[PDB]
Amino acid sequence: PQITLWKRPLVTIRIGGQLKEALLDTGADDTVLEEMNLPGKWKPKMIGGIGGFIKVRQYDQIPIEICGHKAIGTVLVGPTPVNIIGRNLLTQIGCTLNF
Amino acid sequence: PQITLWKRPLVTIRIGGQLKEALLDTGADDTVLEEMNLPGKWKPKMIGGIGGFIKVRQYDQIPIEICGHKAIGTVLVGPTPVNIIGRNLLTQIGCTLNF
Ligand SMILES: CNC(=O)CCC(=O)N[C@@H](Cc1ccccc1)[C@H](O)CN(CC1CC1)S(=O)(=O)c1cccc(OC)c1
């Protein structure tokens, strides 16, 4: 799709069999989801945003379907204000900015 | 132009007499610039993201040029680690997400 920006670019994602709403976030390097359970190994990590740093759990090689497009990559889980899809997965689904 | 997301979507912007590098950020409702002593009236504001909140100064109707496209609107100024062009200005320069 072409998505305009007068509204938040919120899309439905499917991950671990569950449907969630998430924000397409070109200002995010990484994909960060609110507290949830995911299967398999994870590693502690820290990431920075506008207000400082948080601790997250890094899950590698996780499939997510983002607005009908498949990605498999790194998903960070922690106290983000909202589920965000970052550039690591935006690139996988062929997302560009255009003006 | 079309901007891929392999790297951060940083572009040159102009505000006041200063050229700066700024992120084209679909995940940002607002435009948030690094500390700078702009003229005019402002109002205090708090904005929140990963890590928590920062205190900013809200300046209204500030002209900004983003990649040679003219925009004018609200700019938040404060101790952000990166200059952020948010949706309030991205719409003005005709920016969309496409995949
Ligand atoms: C590994 N770190 C990252 O991927 C950064 C994630 C991130 O927080 N991105 C943000 C931009 C940023 C901030 C600080 C440094 C670098 C980029 C993000 O794209 C925009 N952020 C909101 C997203 C939910 C997090 S935000 O910067 O916090 C923001 C901007 C404008 C208005 C806001 O609230 C009204 C909030």
Tab-separated table of C-alpha atoms and ligand atoms in Angstrom:
chain	number	residue	atom	x	y	z
A	1	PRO	CA	0.000	0.000	0.000
A	2	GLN	CA	0.795	3.716	-0.106
A	3	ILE	CA	0.372	5.133	3.404
A	4	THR	CA	-0.085	8.849	4.047
A	5	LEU	CA	0.851	10.419	7.348
A	6	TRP	CA	-2.043	12.620	8.454
A	7	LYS	CA	-2.781	9.664	10.803
A	8	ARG	CA	-0.345	7.415	12.703
A	9	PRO	CA	0.818	4.627	10.348
A	10	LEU	CA	-0.659	1.864	12.540
A	11	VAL	CA	-0.975	-1.605	10.975
A	12	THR	CA	-2.053	-5.047	12.116
A	13	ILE	CA	0.766	-7.549	12.617
A	14	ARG	CA	0.667	-11.310	13.245
A	15	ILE	CA	3.344	-12.704	15.587
A	16	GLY	CA	3.465	-15.929	17.606
A	17	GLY	CA	-0.040	-16.571	16.226
A	18	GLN	CA	-1.435	-13.383	17.783
A	19	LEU	CA	-2.720	-10.214	16.124
A	20	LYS	CA	-1.405	-6.875	17.359
A	21	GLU	CA	-1.419	-3.256	16.253
A	22	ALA	CA	2.005	-1.711	15.645
A	23	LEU	CA	3.459	1.562	14.417
A	24	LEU	CA	5.537	1.770	11.237
A	25	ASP	CA	8.453	3.735	12.622
A	26	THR	CA	11.190	4.870	10.240
A	27	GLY	CA	12.921	6.636	13.186
A	28	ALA	CA	13.493	3.270	14.872
A	29	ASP	CA	16.518	1.118	14.002
A	30	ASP	CA	14.966	-1.842	15.791
A	31	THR	CA	11.551	-3.448	16.207
A	32	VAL	CA	10.321	-3.129	19.784
A	33	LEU	CA	7.104	-4.691	21.108
A	34	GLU	CA	5.355	-4.179	24.418
A	35	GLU	CA	5.669	-6.852	27.093
A	36	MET	CA	4.573	-10.194	25.671
A	37	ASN	CA	5.570	-13.859	25.677
A	38	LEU	CA	7.584	-15.252	22.757
A	39	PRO	CA	9.061	-18.762	22.493
A	40	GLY	CA	12.722	-19.758	22.463
A	41	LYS	CA	15.998	-18.216	23.561
A	42	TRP	CA	16.423	-14.515	24.261
A	43	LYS	CA	19.314	-12.322	25.437
A	44	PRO	CA	19.264	-9.213	27.625
A	45	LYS	CA	19.936	-5.982	25.691
A	46	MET	CA	19.629	-2.233	26.191
A	47	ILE	CA	18.374	0.344	23.710
A	48	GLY	CA	18.103	4.115	23.705
A	49	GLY	CA	15.283	6.400	22.657
A	50	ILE	CA	14.279	9.985	23.191
A	51	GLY	CA	13.959	9.736	26.992
A	52	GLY	CA	16.916	7.485	27.774
A	53	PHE	CA	17.655	3.769	27.848
A	54	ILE	CA	15.594	0.693	28.586
A	55	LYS	CA	16.259	-3.011	29.084
A	56	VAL	CA	14.721	-5.357	26.530
A	57	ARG	CA	14.731	-9.060	25.679
A	58	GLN	CA	16.202	-9.754	22.248
A	59	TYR	CA	14.521	-12.517	20.286
A	60	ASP	CA	16.349	-13.408	17.069
A	61	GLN	CA	14.940	-14.744	13.822
A	62	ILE	CA	11.249	-14.251	14.689
A	63	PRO	CA	8.606	-14.337	11.923
A	64	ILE	CA	6.111	-11.440	11.817
A	65	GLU	CA	3.551	-10.725	9.127
A	66	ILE	CA	3.244	-6.967	8.774
A	67	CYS	CA	0.207	-5.786	6.855
A	68	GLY	CA	0.251	-8.993	4.757
A	69	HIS	CA	4.033	-8.942	4.181
A	70	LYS	CA	6.333	-11.535	5.748
A	71	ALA	CA	9.430	-10.652	7.746
A	72	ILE	CA	11.741	-12.818	9.876
A	73	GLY	CA	14.111	-10.946	12.134
A	74	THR	CA	15.072	-9.535	15.486
A	75	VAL	CA	12.295	-8.525	17.839
A	76	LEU	CA	12.950	-6.667	21.078
A	77	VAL	CA	10.404	-6.917	23.904
A	78	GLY	CA	10.253	-4.335	26.673
A	79	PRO	CA	8.762	-1.073	27.983
A	80	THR	CA	8.272	0.778	24.701
A	81	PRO	CA	5.302	3.221	24.786
A	82	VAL	CA	3.842	1.443	21.734
A	83	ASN	CA	4.617	-1.543	19.482
A	84	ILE	CA	6.973	-0.229	16.808
A	85	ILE	CA	8.167	-1.792	13.591
A	86	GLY	CA	11.705	-0.518	12.984
A	87	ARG	CA	13.994	-0.424	9.948
A	88	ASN	CA	15.270	-3.992	10.451
A	89	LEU	CA	11.800	-5.265	9.405
A	90	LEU	CA	10.669	-2.290	7.286
A	91	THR	CA	13.497	-3.083	4.900
A	92	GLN	CA	12.408	-6.744	4.733
A	93	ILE	CA	8.873	-5.851	3.580
A	94	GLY	CA	10.184	-3.393	0.947
A	95	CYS	CA	9.149	-0.185	2.697
A	96	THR	CA	10.524	3.137	1.394
A	97	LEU	CA	9.826	6.794	2.043
A	98	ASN	CA	8.618	8.782	-0.943
A	99	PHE	CA	7.930	12.455	-1.567
B	1	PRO	CA	12.790	11.135	-4.138
B	2	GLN	CA	12.619	7.571	-2.815
B	3	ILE	CA	14.491	6.842	0.407
B	4	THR	CA	15.277	3.235	1.352
B	5	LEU	CA	15.628	2.253	5.009
B	6	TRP	CA	18.932	0.326	4.984
B	7	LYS	CA	20.298	3.264	6.968
B	8	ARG	CA	18.641	5.981	9.025
B	9	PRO	CA	16.585	8.341	6.785
B	10	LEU	CA	18.613	11.423	7.650
B	11	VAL	CA	18.177	14.479	5.449
B	12	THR	CA	19.348	18.082	5.469
B	13	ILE	CA	16.854	20.562	6.915
B	14	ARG	CA	17.010	24.336	7.280
B	15	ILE	CA	15.592	26.228	10.262
B	16	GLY	CA	16.572	29.709	11.412
B	17	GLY	CA	19.910	30.128	9.660
B	18	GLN	CA	21.060	26.654	10.606
B	19	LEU	CA	21.393	23.601	8.403
B	20	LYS	CA	20.983	20.347	10.317
B	21	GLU	CA	20.636	16.620	9.676
B	22	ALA	CA	17.240	15.224	10.667
B	23	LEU	CA	15.413	11.914	10.636
B	24	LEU	CA	12.293	11.564	8.453
B	25	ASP	CA	10.283	9.849	11.181
B	26	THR	CA	6.870	8.256	10.572
B	27	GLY	CA	6.856	7.127	14.228
B	28	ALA	CA	6.898	10.743	15.486
B	29	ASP	CA	3.649	12.730	15.791
B	30	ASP	CA	5.712	15.863	16.297
B	31	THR	CA	8.884	17.521	15.067
B	32	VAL	CA	11.583	17.612	17.769
B	33	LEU	CA	14.821	19.484	17.248
B	34	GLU	CA	18.014	19.519	19.244
B	35	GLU	CA	18.494	22.452	21.600
B	36	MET	CA	18.676	25.796	19.763
B	37	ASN	CA	17.913	29.344	20.869
B	38	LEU	CA	15.054	30.230	18.484
B	39	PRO	CA	13.339	33.602	18.718
B	40	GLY	CA	9.676	33.988	19.616
B	41	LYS	CA	7.089	32.801	22.085
B	42	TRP	CA	6.927	29.162	23.095
B	43	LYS	CA	5.035	26.937	25.531
B	44	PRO	CA	6.501	24.164	27.689
B	45	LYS	CA	5.631	20.570	26.844
B	46	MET	CA	6.583	17.017	27.781
B	47	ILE	CA	6.960	14.295	25.171
B	48	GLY	CA	7.474	10.612	25.881
B	49	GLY	CA	9.178	7.750	24.128
B	50	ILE	CA	11.577	4.908	24.820
B	51	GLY	CA	13.376	5.753	28.071
B	52	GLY	CA	10.694	8.158	29.313
B	53	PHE	CA	9.935	11.844	28.845
B	54	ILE	CA	11.894	14.945	27.921
B	55	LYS	CA	10.950	18.559	28.490
B	56	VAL	CA	10.684	20.626	25.292
B	57	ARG	CA	9.755	24.137	24.170
B	58	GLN	CA	6.922	24.324	21.636
B	59	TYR	CA	7.326	27.013	18.971
B	60	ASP	CA	4.439	27.492	16.504
B	61	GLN	CA	4.440	28.468	12.803
B	62	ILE	CA	8.184	28.048	12.323
B	63	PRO	CA	9.278	27.820	8.677
B	64	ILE	CA	11.510	24.799	7.918
B	65	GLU	CA	12.913	23.553	4.605
B	66	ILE	CA	13.259	19.763	4.339
B	67	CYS	CA	15.199	18.562	1.253
B	68	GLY	CA	14.304	21.745	-0.624
B	69	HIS	CA	10.605	21.381	0.220
B	70	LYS	CA	9.051	24.206	2.224
B	71	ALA	CA	7.117	23.508	5.396
B	72	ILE	CA	5.810	25.593	8.283
B	73	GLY	CA	4.448	24.457	11.619
B	74	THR	CA	5.060	23.436	15.186
B	75	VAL	CA	8.607	22.619	16.289
B	76	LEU	CA	9.490	21.174	19.695
B	77	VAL	CA	12.959	22.119	20.964
B	78	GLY	CA	14.790	20.262	23.675
B	79	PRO	CA	17.482	17.748	24.655
B	80	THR	CA	16.697	15.134	22.030
B	81	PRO	CA	19.735	13.106	20.864
B	82	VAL	CA	18.658	13.422	17.219
B	83	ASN	CA	16.711	15.907	15.095
B	84	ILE	CA	13.313	14.385	14.287
B	85	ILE	CA	10.979	15.419	11.451
B	86	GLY	CA	7.544	14.193	12.510
B	87	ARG	CA	4.240	13.667	10.758
B	88	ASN	CA	3.111	17.283	11.205
B	89	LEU	CA	5.771	18.329	8.644
B	90	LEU	CA	6.087	15.087	6.662
B	91	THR	CA	2.520	15.536	5.368
B	92	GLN	CA	3.390	19.065	4.233
B	93	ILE	CA	6.252	17.868	2.012
B	94	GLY	CA	4.163	15.051	0.528
B	95	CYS	CA	5.931	12.176	2.261
B	96	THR	CA	4.377	8.685	2.179
B	97	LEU	CA	5.348	5.147	3.181
B	98	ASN	CA	5.197	2.626	0.351
B	99	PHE	CA	5.533	-1.147	0.108
C	1	LIG	C1	17.902	1.463	19.060
C	1	LIG	N1	17.138	2.695	19.176
C	1	LIG	C2	16.159	3.005	18.325
C	1	LIG	O1	15.824	2.258	17.396
C	1	LIG	C3	15.457	4.324	18.529
C	1	LIG	C4	13.988	4.045	18.734
C	1	LIG	C5	13.253	5.339	18.913
C	1	LIG	O2	12.928	5.635	20.048
C	1	LIG	N2	12.948	6.095	17.850
C	1	LIG	C6	12.219	7.370	17.937
C	1	LIG	C7	13.054	8.476	17.287
C	1	LIG	C8	14.409	8.518	17.949
C	1	LIG	C9	14.561	9.070	19.209
C	1	LIG	C10	15.805	9.069	19.814
C	1	LIG	C11	16.911	8.558	19.173
C	1	LIG	C12	16.771	8.000	17.911
C	1	LIG	C13	15.525	7.983	17.306
C	1	LIG	C14	10.826	7.221	17.297
C	1	LIG	O3	10.966	7.052	15.887
C	1	LIG	C15	9.856	8.393	17.586
C	1	LIG	N3	9.519	8.317	19.027
C	1	LIG	C16	8.157	7.795	19.276
C	1	LIG	C17	8.174	6.284	19.031
C	1	LIG	C18	7.386	5.396	19.996
C	1	LIG	C19	8.906	5.431	20.071
C	1	LIG	S1	9.876	9.648	19.893
C	1	LIG	O4	11.146	10.132	19.448
C	1	LIG	O5	9.900	9.237	21.270
C	1	LIG	C20	8.751	10.857	19.741
C	1	LIG	C21	8.875	11.836	18.754
C	1	LIG	C22	7.917	12.844	18.635
C	1	LIG	C23	6.838	12.881	19.505
C	1	LIG	C24	6.697	11.898	20.492
C	1	LIG	O6	5.645	11.879	21.387
C	1	LIG	C25	4.467	12.662	21.237
C	1	LIG	C26	7.659	10.899	20.603
